[PDB]
Structure 1
């Protein structure tokens, strides 16, 4: 019931993927799809005009910031930017609480990226306007989790069915210790009938805190077993019967056409990007690779999220 769920999402801050429930995730995935088709058919997309937002990027994060700016502009709204700056030069004197209390009186909402853990939680306390977390230094990056999930759902829409018979399996590969992109998606995936293969070098294993959240969430839905989670130190074994391969950022695990010879027919490769050697150019040509569609889907998910939070009357729903 889009309209029940829209009323509930109106003026919601999105900081953590756990701020988004079952019903909300469904509206986001249904709305993101409507924006994918509207844009792909070159139709009018101005479903959120008359908003003025502030984008605050206190670390270099060009790809994410351009993603949000494009979302806002394609919806027909305007944005004022703070950019190419850091915590100390932005907040010259000033308490984060004063800066957000004032900033939030000029605009309808704020997109905030800040390496500081604390600063985003203060910004939410202090802001009279909704804030969307664009990434901080606890690894909260909800929009990346949501667009990772949207990608996977398009190839395997039975993840949403919670079907004891239809289980999805995924390999996370590379640096699982620091890959906060893995942690955030794991958290979201484990809400569903999903199995995990953690492929790493020893001193970059998945943290225990994360194994525990997966284990807790799989048990809540009666999908936990001894084949819920498995750990490999090599691709050959690790890439076995997996519907998704998700490669992390920063040798041990370079994806090549050779190393994809014994994967499922239907397997799809994700990567939050940028890459460096993790995935060889040769793989871009391989029909299993979808990391570029994934990045593209960021636009449709960020538009859907802005639409669902900031729409006023909302009557003329996306079609």
Structure 2
């Protein structure tokens, strides 16, 4: 590992390794090896996200690195990448344009970690999601997944569907309105079975993992088609109760109201734990790039 731009940058072997390092770092001992000691990572979030900025910041600090960075704001991505190369030993970037990280990674000598590019990918988030799943079931092979909500414009879904190709899912249910369906291009990449469906109550009873993404108003024919459809891609307390005893509900946070807040008190709610592995998982990805 060097550039982390796509979920395809990871092999199954690299992922099993990152999981083991995440176990170790989780068990938050005061002797973690400071593999980034004397190194500066720059966090270049052209498109802001405080949750994710702070999460990489804390990983980098836990490993002994110094952090520089910016958040927001006619200078070329290439010129900025060049400058960060004078100033730092690696870059974590978040950008509004698809492919931005790919392109930075080709300009750049130091590693570049994609923390979100446009609607294309967010690979570290996918690593966090599968880490949470494998932690719960001691496996990823054999599981039955359902992705619920917007599956067309969500980079986390794109990264999760791609990373799952390093594993053997039994089946991935794609549950969305007709409008928010996974694009053809992305479905032709996959090497595991998938089935499109409009209502989650049809198959909720079968699914090991339910992964939800927000539907946004700002994305519809008119406000009336959104108001008619919005209601049935929420994770309600009733949809939670119809899931199997051992199943989990996942969501890459923040949330607004796509999850009934009463759900956070059930044992199936796992999105809180999911956000909590973010730091050790990113420490591990960083350890695989700089410390091996």
TM-score, structure 2 length as denominator? 0.89
Please state how far the C-alpha of 1:118 moved relative to its aligned partner.
4.4
Aligned residue in 1 for 2:125: 144
**Which stretch of the first structure deviates more once superposed, 297-306 or 101-110?**
101-110
Aligned residue in 2 for 1:177: 152
1:15 aligns with 2:8: no
1:67 aligns with 2:55: yes
C-alpha distance in structure 1 between counterparts of 2:237 and 2:79, whole Å? 54
Aligned residue in 2 for 1:234: 199
C-alpha distance in structure 1 between counterparts of 2:65 and 2:201, whole Å? 48
C-alpha distance in structure 1 between counterparts of 2:48 and 2:87, whole Å? 24
C-alpha distance in structure 2 between counterparts of 1:283 and 1:104, whole Å? 45
Trace 1:75-86 onto structure 2 (pairs within 5 A). 75-83=63-71, 85-86=72-73
Trace 1:1-319 onto structure 2 (pairs within 5 A). 9=1, 12-37=2-27, 39=28, 42-48=29-35, 49-83=37-71, 85-86=72-73, 88=74, 91=75, 95-159=76-140, 167-194=142-169, 195-214=171-190, 217-218=191-192, 228-250=193-215, 251-311=231-291
C-alpha distance in structure 1 between counterparts of 2:150 and 2:23, whole Å? 31
C-alpha distance in structure 1 between counterparts of 2:198 and 2:99, whole Å? 35
CA 256–99 in structure 1, closer or farther in 2 if over 3 Å, else same: closer
Contact 2:7 / 2:123 at 8 angstroms: preserved in 1?
yes
**Which stretch of the first structure deviates more once superposed, 294-303 or 47-56?**
47-56
Contact 1:198 / 1:238 at 8 angstroms: preserved in 2?
no
CA 230–118 in structure 1, closer or farther in 2 if over 3 Å, else same: closer
Please state how far the C-alpha of 1:284 moved relative to its aligned partner.
0.2
Partner SS for 1:158: coil
CA 209–238 in structure 1, closer or farther in 2 if over 3 Å, else same: farther
Instruction: Tell me the number of residue pairs that the alignment of Structure 1 and Structure 2 aligns.
Output: 275
CA 253–309 in structure 1, closer or farther in 2 if over 3 Å, else same: same
1:177-225 deviation digits (Å, cap 9, x = unpaired) = 21221121011113322111111111112212222122xx23xxxxxxx
C-alpha distance in structure 2 between counterparts of 1:255 and 1:171, whole Å? 12
C-alpha distance in structure 2 between counterparts of 1:107 and 1:128, whole Å? 10
- Could you list the structure 1 runs, at least 4 aligned residues long, displaced by more than 6 angstroms after superposition: none
Please state how far the C-alpha of 1:230 moved relative to its aligned partner.
2.2
C-alpha distance in structure 2 between counterparts of 1:82 and 1:19, whole Å? 26
Uncovered stretches (5+) of structure 2, i.e. residues with no partner: 216-230
Please state how far the C-alpha of 1:246 moved relative to its aligned partner.
0.4
Partner SS for 2:214: coil
C-alpha distance in structure 2 between counterparts of 1:305 and 1:105, whole Å? 23
Please state how far the C-alpha of 1:307 moved relative to its aligned partner.
1.4
Uncovered stretches (5+) of structure 1, i.e. residues with no partner: 1-8, 219-227, 315-319
Please state how far the C-alpha of 1:257 moved relative to its aligned partner.
2.1
**Which stretch of the first structure deviates more once superposed, 52-61 or 200-209?**
200-209
Contact 1:97 / 1:123 at 8 angstroms: preserved in 2?
yes
